[PDB]
Design a protein around this nucleic acid. Sequence first.
RNA 1: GGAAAACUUGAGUGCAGAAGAGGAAAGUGGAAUUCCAUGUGUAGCGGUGAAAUGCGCAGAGAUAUGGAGGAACACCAGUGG
Length: 114
Amino acid sequence: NIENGVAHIRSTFNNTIVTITDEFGNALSWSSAGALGFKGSKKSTPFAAQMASETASKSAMEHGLKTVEVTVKGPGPGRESAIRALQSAGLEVTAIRDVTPVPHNGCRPPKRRR
RNA sequence: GGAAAACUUGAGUGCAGAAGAGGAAAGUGGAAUUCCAUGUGUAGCGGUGAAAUGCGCAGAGAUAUGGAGGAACACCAGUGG
């Protein structure tokens, strides 16, 4: 089980959740990013993806996987403070992938915020 | 003004080629919001200028080889055509 996997996050503008999994997704543990008492304008922190990143990473305890190769699929304030700060656990982050959804003009997008 | 002609610039009928988002018809595939299901797990997830309604204990989202739908299809994109 150990030494391989994907630290599958999707770092949104609020509540960048972290789900560690394998290289074929099975989600050994995940972490809700509001687990540090972040409720309103608070999960958009560096620290929502610093310690709640390792509230499932340091508390993995199931595979003991060490090579993580974290993957991000969205923009957020805790994005650069997620891939750095999943390695706040010190879990040898190796291969970050910017495989984000880029639709070739996918649908009809919503309205401007006045 | 009418009567008898011509020339071709102006226009049309020729010939050699350039380009395309020009209108009506057939294909190839991507990515996304929504759903139902696996794995997964349990405290929050979403939304907030400020919090909350809500959606959460059914697993809500999550997460990938991979299951689908609606609809269009960034890149070539321009005082371009």
